Design a protein around this ligand. Structure first.
Ligand SMILES: [Mg+2]
Ligand SMILES: [Mg+2]
Ligand SMILES: [Mg+2]
Ligand SMILES: [Mg+2]
Ligand SMILES: [Mg+2]
Ligand SMILES: [Mg+2]
Ligand SMILES: [Mg+2]
Ligand SMILES: [Mg+2]
Ligand SMILES: [Mg+2]
Ligand SMILES: [Mg+2]
Ligand SMILES: [Mg+2]
Length: 131
RNA sequence: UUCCCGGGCCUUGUACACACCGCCCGUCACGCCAUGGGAGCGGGCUCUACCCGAAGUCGCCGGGAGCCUACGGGCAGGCG
């Protein structure tokens, strides 16, 4: 037998391919289905992705934002059915896979360290030229 | 005629005149009031240095690159 293949097989039903590719450093908006009273609704969460742990179906990514004066980080499964959509709001250029150092940087300092990933922006406009 | 009791006259000192059986000082005990000091405790104002930093004006850039053109430009956008 092939244990890996069997696992991928169990997983194949839950895999998603409708979400856009993004990198650590990109700014991203995750529309997330969320439960309250007595309804479920979509809440957006928008921030820099500071990390993407890979493990195929199990890869997860972490997004950080400042909300009303307090730092928040959210961790999402990339294949979570609760994600309605992800919109790329900006491409940042990182030099590092994991950006935990931005937790201690000022807003000025961050903006200086994560400049616009001019290449991947142009690349983004190049597509988005449709038929 | 020094002394004691009483009185007369002159004088001198007096913070006494309820007139020396006068006046009056301080501690101590007691009650009341205001205050000082006192390990500290709470508050108000104020100065200094540095970190972060909204809005906004000003200044630079406006390109790997957007919109308007009125295109040697302007607006978005970025930096300070
Ligand atoms: Mg395995
Ligand atoms: Mg909400
Ligand atoms: Mg006599
Ligand atoms: Mg006589
Ligand atoms: Mg006192
Ligand atoms: Mg006292
Ligand atoms: Mg004090
Ligand atoms: Mg004080
Ligand atoms: Mg400091
Ligand atoms: Mg400053
Ligand atoms: Mg121009």
């Amino acid at each position: 037998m092939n244990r890996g293949a069997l696992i991928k097989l169990v997983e194949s039903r839950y895999v998603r391919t409708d979400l856009p590719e993004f990198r650590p450093g990109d700014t991203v908006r995750v529309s997330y289905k969320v439960k309250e009273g007595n309804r479920t609704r979509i809440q957006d969460f928008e921030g820099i992705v500071i990390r993407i742990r890979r493990n195929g179906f199990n890869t997860t990514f972490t997004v950080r934002k400042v909300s009303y004066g307090v730092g928040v980080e959210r961790i999402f499964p990339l294949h979570s059915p609760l994600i309605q959509k992800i919109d790329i709001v900006q491409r940042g250029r990182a030099r590092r896979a994991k950006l935990y150092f931005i937790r201690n940087l000022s807003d000025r300092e961050i903006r200086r360290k994560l400049r616009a990933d001019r290449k991947r922006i142009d690349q983004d406009r190049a597509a988005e030229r449709a038929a």
